[PDB]
DNA sequence: CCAGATCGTGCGACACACCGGGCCAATTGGCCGATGCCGTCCCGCGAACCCCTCTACCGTGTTGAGCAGCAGCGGCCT
């Protein structure tokens, strides 16, 4: 749909804002991954490898999160982070 | 001295020498032909085997020695 240039600009701006929001959520939640991954230390894999795998798990969780359930975001992220790490 | 061993000689036997015949025994060894059991394969189903996915009270920090180059500083020079 052609729509109007101003509406297209506004839609692009909100899309960029949503991308920024996703990023911001990821940086805010990296500390949770770091906290979770420290109790699996040893057993071959090193600390930073575990942290990065947990980061991938957290990204996956953020890709599939909803707020209608009225629960704090830490729970879903914790489940997925532990699953990915193990 | 003279009589048997050795050998000469002789007669016979004769064990085969031949080189050629004319049949035979034993013993075949092929698979002929007919009959029968095993290797291969093509499913058929099912046990297991490996991979992927998701869970929402919440939870937010791991010696000695030798030789050479670089950083800081005292002190001219402008």
Q: What is the resolution of this structure in A?
A: 3.2
Report the nucleotide nearest the CA of residue A51, measured to C1'.
Answer: B62
Q: CA A67 to CA A80: how far, in whole Å?
A: 16
List b or e across A67-82, with b for residues whose CB sees 16 or more CB atoms inside 10 angstroms: eeeeeeeeebbbebbe
Q: CA A30 to CA A33: how far, in whole Å?
A: 5
The spacing between the Cα labelled CA in A21 and the C1' in B34, in angstroms, equals: 92
Chain A residues 41-80 with Cβ under 7 Å of strand B are 41, 47, 64-66, 69, 71-76, 78-80
Question: Protein footprint on strand B: which nucleotides are under 7 Å from a CB?
Answer: 54-62
A71: helix, strand or coil: coil
């Amino acid at each position: 749909d052609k729509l109007a240039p101003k509406l297209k600009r506004e839609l692009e701006i909100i899309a960029e804002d949503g991308r920024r929001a996703k990023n911001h959520l990821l940086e805010a939640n990296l500390r949770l991954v770091v906290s979770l991954a420290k109790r699996y230390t040893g057993r071959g894999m090193l600390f930073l490898d575990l942290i990065q795998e947990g980061n991938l798990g957290l990204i996956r969780a953020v890709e599939k999160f909803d707020y209608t359930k009225g629960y704090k975001f830490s729970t879903y992220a914790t489940w997925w982070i532990r699953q990915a790490i193990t």
